[PDB]
């Protein structure tokens, strides 16, 4: 007597929701921007190699100095590398091997982890002895952690398979708010620049915008066939970017809360592991799991180059803060480094 | 190349050094994954070889150190960490014989052992698992000889003759089972009813993961 | 707290031989590669031996090669100089100075108490133009230092440590690279530098403020202090 009108109701705001997506659907990006000249063929190439890992390889993030960088793999070890010179500065060995997730705080004094084991570890790496100690042991969550991201050197927003993103207070240990909006498993992760809002992209296939001093989804985004694996950012902080199995990317807008453009290939059927963009937003790059990298001009959703150096799938990338060089990990146990 | 950096590359090859001890001590580790239905005698099998987040259990039985991976307890989506330990020797499936008269409670609607057969399909022939080979354990023995008196197994399974006789049954559901691989050219099935002696059980396993160890080593150097 | 005590010496007839212990429990002693910096009284820091982390370097100073033979024992956490045919010049305050080499480390961080030895009877070079300044407290103070050659490298950070000696005390690591502030020292502290002519600026004196500043290159051995600047209220 109640279950049916509730869901009449939300059927009929669905609609409204839409139609009013509609309405401002006067215009499409795809076709605004023929007037900019083509990016035209883009050539990157491998700087270097940091080799050392002896298993599959799940996670990597750039530090804020652009030249340390964190990596996670599944044979139990966390490898921090300088990228200049390709030289291990620690060897973090984890409690538990099955990790799938890594971060790097922004003033680089901690770095986080996670995995089946569902609990982002914090190791603190600046002690007043020589080695690096777990800070923190987060738990709480009941799925495994797919993501989680240092806001500051005190807080943290982790993501988890059970359809819940919970934001941390690393002192005391336990979770000071979460974000239960989503239906399937919650895939990845990502931070506005400004680190006001974040969006995560779950299983459902949609993507949803959160607010972290609230606690409340501010809009939720659909439109993928498929679960989304990977989530990121447009350097401005008004857009993002999706990736998931259907081999189709997509750029959808806060303001206008629809999406804007979609990034697909016929040749290409194979999902997306990860995406990220440049430091402009010219760029687009796709880490696809037909054991390379894509490149896409955001703005005219052509194919602007490929990275095609790795033996097996690349699982994570991701681009410098300052925009030298892109990282990009593979499950060949190798990580590359492009520019 | 100052005196900093000098010190730093040597630091960087003794974690070099330690990462290749730790790797290589590693490669001499049986990383077996054990599945199964979770009320299919999982834990008598694990505690035989015995003596959140996916339990681990750790032991040796001759100079061979063996890791097996209980990851029943995730109920997330099977498919978002299967390539996790898409790198396993082998997959053990204990199922369990006697539950042709009981239906599982959530749906009632299908059989119990029917669902760890759409399981077993469906970890047989993933894109992941096309080399790993599996180990079946057909736990409960006693309670299916005692039990098979009562019911037959034309329930379960209605394309069957009705010897109604522990042996003839136990064949036609290791057949059934069996016929699940799709890739036969690839991966083979290792069967065993679980024993009441605890040395049995280990010594199978021990068996079928030295037989495919047997075959990665062929592999590797061609002959396979 | 980190600590690194060491005992030795006391009285040595010349040509003689003795050892030199340093015991550093409780913390990383295998990583850390350990330093013996020796002071002749009432004269500066004079660097001796060097030992890498897992005993796979080791130098010597000019003056001690041949002589002296500097080992660790990493399983007991403990330093050692074996002292052969020792002079009367030998006689100074041993200390004990643990490093850590990484990018981005604080190396020179922690000096050990300091053991006394009596023995009874090219290089880059740093010079520090004054070795005593009276100012009075609450003002600012520039002590500067050259060096013979620029010690900026193809790395882009120049190779400069500051040290403080209390009247009493060991020295202790403010600035490293002659800019990064060393953790554990107030902000009034601040260093800079241009290849081969540096200085150093405190902000405001204090009664713990007062001492001897020593100011050392790092970019290759053997590493060579300056001559110290006492600063007094």
């Known amino acids: 007597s109640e279950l049916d009108q509730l869901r009449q109701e939300a059927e009929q705001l669905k609609n409204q929701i839409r139609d009013a997506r509609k309405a401002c659907a006067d215009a499409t990006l795809s076709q605004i921007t023929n007037n900019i000249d083509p990016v035209g063929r883009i050539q990157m190439r491998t700087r270097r190699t940091l080799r050392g890992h002896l298993a599959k390889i799940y996670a990597m993030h750039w530090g804020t100095d652009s030249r340390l960088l964190v990596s996670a793999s599944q044979d139990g070890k966390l490898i921090i590398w300088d990228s200049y010179t390709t030289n291990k500065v620690h060897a973090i060995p984890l409690r538990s091997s099955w990790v799938m997730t890594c971060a790097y705080a922004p003033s680089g004094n901690y770095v986080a982890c996670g995995g089946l084991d569902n609990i982002c570890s914090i190791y603190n790496l600046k002690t007043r002895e020589g080695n690096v100690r777990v800070s923190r042991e987060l738990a709480g969550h009941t799925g495994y952690l797919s993501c989680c991201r240092f806001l500051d050197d005190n807080q943290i927003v982790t993501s988890s398979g059970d359809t819940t993103c919970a934001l941390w207070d690393i002192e005391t240990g336990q979770q000071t708010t979460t974000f239960t909006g989503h239906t399937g498993d919650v895939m990845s992760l990502s931070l506005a620049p400004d680190t006001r809002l974040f969006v995560s992209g779950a299983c459902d296939a949609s993507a949803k915008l959160w607010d972290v001093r609230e606690g409340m989804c501010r809009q939720t985004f659909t439109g993928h066939e498929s679960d989304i694996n990977a989530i990121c950012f447009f350097p401005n902080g008004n857009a993002f970017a999706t990736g998931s199995d259907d081999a189709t990317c997509r750029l959808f807008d806060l303001r206008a809360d629809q999406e804007l453009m979609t990034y697909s290939h016929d040749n290409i059927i194979c999902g997306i592991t990860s995406v990220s963009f440049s430091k402009s937003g010219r760029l687009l790059l796709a880490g696809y799991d037909d054991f390379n990298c894509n490149v896409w001009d955001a703005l005219k959703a052509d194919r602007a180059g490929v990275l095609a150096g790795h033996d097996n799938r690349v699982s994570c990338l991701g681009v410098t803060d300052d925009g030298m060089a892109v990282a990009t990990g593979s499950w060949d146990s190798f990580l590359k480094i492009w520019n | 190349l100052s005196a900093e950096d000098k010190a730093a590359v040597e630091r960087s090859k003794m974690i070099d050094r330690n990462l290749r001890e730790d790797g290589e001590k590693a490669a001499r580790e049986v990383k077996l994954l054990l599945l199964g239905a979770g009320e299919s005698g999982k834990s008598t099998i694990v505690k035989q070889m015995k003596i959140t987040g996916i339990v681990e259990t750790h032991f040796t039985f001759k100079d061979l150190h063996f890791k097996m991976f209980d990851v029943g307890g995730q109920r997330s989506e099977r498919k978002k960490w299967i390539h996790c330990f898409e790198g396993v020797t082998a997959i053990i499936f204990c199922v369990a014989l006697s539950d042709y008269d009981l239906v599982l409670a959530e749906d009632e609607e299908m059989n119990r052992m029917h669902e760890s057969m759409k399981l077993f399909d469906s970890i047989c022939n993933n894109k992941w698992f096309t080399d790993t080979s599996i180990i079946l354990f057909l736990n409960k023995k006693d309670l299916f000889e005692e039990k098979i008196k009562k019911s037959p197994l034309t329930i379960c399974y209605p394309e069957y003759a009705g010897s109604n006789t522990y042996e003839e049954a136990a064949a036609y559901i290791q057949c059934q089972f069996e016929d699940l691989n799709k890739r036969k050219d690839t991966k083979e099935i290792y069967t065993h009813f679980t024993c009441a002696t605890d040395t049995k059980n280990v010594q199978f396993v021990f068996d079928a993961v030295t037989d495919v160890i047997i075959k990665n080593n062929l592999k590797d150097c061609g002959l396979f | 707290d980190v600590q690194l005590v060491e005992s030795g010496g006391g009285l040595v007839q010349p040509g003689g031989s003795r050892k030199l212990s340093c015991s550093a429990s409780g913390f990383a002693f295998s990583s850390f590669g350990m330093h013996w910096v020796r002071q002749a009284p009432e004269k500066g820091l004079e660097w001796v031996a060097y030992?890498?982390?897992?005993?796979?370097?080791?130098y010597y100073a000019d003056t001690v090669k041949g002589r002296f033979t500097i080992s660790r024992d990493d399983p007991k956490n403990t330093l050692f100089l074996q002292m052969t045919s020792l002079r009367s010049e030998d006689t100074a305050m041993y200390y004990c100075?643990?490093?850590?080499?990484?990018?981005?480390?604080?190396?020179?961080?922690?000096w050990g108490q300091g053991t006394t030895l009596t023995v009874s009877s090219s290089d880059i070079v740093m010079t520090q133009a004054t070795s005593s300044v009276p100012v009075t407290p609450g003002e600012s103070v520039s002590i500067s230092c050259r060096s013979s050659?620029?010690?900026?490298?193809?790395?882009?950070?120049?190779?400069l440590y500051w040290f403080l000696q209390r009247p009493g005390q060991s020295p202790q690591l403010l600035i490293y690279?002659?800019?990064n502030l060393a953790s554990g020292v107030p902000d009034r502290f601040s260093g800079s530098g241009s290849g081969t002519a540096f200085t150093l600026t405190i902000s405001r004196l204090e009664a713990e403020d007062v001492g001897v500043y020593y100011c050392?290159?790092?970019?290759?051995?053997?590493?060579?202090f300056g001559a110290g600047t006492k600063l007094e209220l």
């Open positions: 100075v643990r490093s850590i080499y990484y990018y981005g480390s604080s190396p020179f961080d922690f």
């Open positions: 050392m290159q790092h970019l290759e051995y053997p590493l060579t």
């Open positions: 690279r002659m800019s």
């Open positions: 030992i890498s982390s897992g005993s796979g370097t080791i």
């Open positions: 050659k620029s010690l900026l490298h193809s790395n882009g950070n120049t190779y």
